[PDB]
Amino acid sequence: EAQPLKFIAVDYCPESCTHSPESSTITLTFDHRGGSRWRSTTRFQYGTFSSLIQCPKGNTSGLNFNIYLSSLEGDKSQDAIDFEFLGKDKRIVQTNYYTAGTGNREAIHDLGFDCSDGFHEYVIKWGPDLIQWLIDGKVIRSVRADGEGFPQKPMFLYASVWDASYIDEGRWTGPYVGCDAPYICLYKNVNVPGTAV
Ligand SMILES: OC[C@H]1O[C@H](O)[C@H](O)[C@@H](O)[C@@H]1O[C@@H]1O[C@H](CO[C@H]2OC[C@@H](O)[C@H](O)[C@H]2O)[C@@H](O[C@@H]2O[C@H](CO[C@H]3OC[C@@H](O)[C@H](O)[C@H]3O)[C@@H](O[C@@H]3O[C@H](CO[C@H]4OC[C@@H](O)[C@H](O)[C@H]4O)[C@@H](O[C@@H]4O[C@H](CO)[C@@H](O[C@@H]5O[C@H](CO[C@H]6OC[C@@H](O)[C@H](O)[C@H]6O)[C@@H](O[C@@H]6O[C@H](CO[C@H]7OC[C@@H](O)[C@H](O)[C@H]7O)[C@@H](O[C@@H]7O[C@H](CO[C@H]8OC[C@@H](O)[C@H](O)[C@H]8O)[C@@H](O)[C@H](O)[C@H]7O)[C@H](O)[C@H]6O)[C@H](O)[C@H]5O)[C@H](O)[C@H]4O)[C@H](O)[C@H]3O)[C@H](O)[C@H]2O)[C@H](O)[C@H]1O
């Protein structure tokens, strides 16, 4: 069971995030101001998380748009589970998860569409032994604890837009060209789990 996320917090640059109780839509803008990041106001202990997302039009090289769970953004030993769009290529999405700070579980999926063409539904189902990633109702990846480290700390829902062109000398998301700024990423109908802590 999930229900609409009624309140969010904005972690930095609140001028670059728009939201309103009358709107089911949240927007994140990247431009010279440097992007922003919103989150749920509580953590959650397992459950189903979802959003419709429409990514920005234009040449998004360099940028990272995302929606993810994390025990605390900026923590070096965080638990987390990610959808990340890599701006150089809007027909793919990257999934990954972190256990006590250790990641390196990247997988690249072909979307079958351009993520800026319209709204699509991105879902994370997170349980104590199982993580599923779904796009438009289809399971694209799933993983189990398998006797190894697994995300178990309570986690916030997060989403940001940022300039990741500095990562891996631009190999990860591309150089930031920035010719279609402002880049507006749309989130609509965000839902969250009864497991808030
Ligand atoms: O992807 C997804 C996921 O995945 C997975 O899971 C993984 O694992 C994860 O991680 C992920 O996630 C993601 O990630 C990413 C990355 O990251 C990561 O990794 C790495 C690490 O590192 C990290 O941590 C992690 O996280 C991300 O992305 C990112 O993010 C980040 C953030 O984060 C962080 O944070 C948050 C938290 O939570 C934590 O911590 C963490 O996390 C980010 O960062 C950020 O950024 C931003 C932006 O920026 C950028 O962009 C843009 C550009 O520009 C830049 O360069 C860059 O950097 C930032 O922001 C910033 O800040 C600063 C600080 O604060 C600021 O500055 C300031 O300003 C102010 C002003 O302001 C204004 O204007 C403008 C606007 O803006 C604002 O708002 C307004 O308000 C100023 O104030 C002033 O002051 C003055 C004084 O002072 C001066 O003097 C002295 C000296 O010393 C100084 O220096 C100077 O300044 C004053 O003056 C005075 O006055 C008085 C009075 O007067 C008055 O009255 C009267 C009349 O007559 C007059 O005229 C007036 O004036 C007088 O008397 C006297 O004379 C004078 O002097 C004034 O008043 C005032 O006003 C200040 O000062 C300054 O300082 C700025 O502005 C801004 O810009 C921030 O900080 C940062 O942090 C990054 O970037 C990204 O990339 C993501 O998110 C995730 O999700």
Automatic annotation (TrEMBL):
Keywords: Glycosidase, Hydrolase. The keyword DNA repair does not apply. The active site is at residues 80, 84. The keyword 4Fe-4S does not apply. GO terms for biological process: carbohydrate metabolic process. One of its GO terms (molecular function) is hydrolase activity, hydrolyzing O-glycosyl compounds. Disulfide bonds join 55-115. Gene3D superfamilies: 2.60.120.200. Residues 1-192 form the GH16 domain. PANTHER family: XYLOGLUCAN ENDOTRANSGLUCOSYLASE/HYDROLASE PROTEIN 8-RELATED. This is GH16 domain-containing protein. It comes from Vitis vinifera.
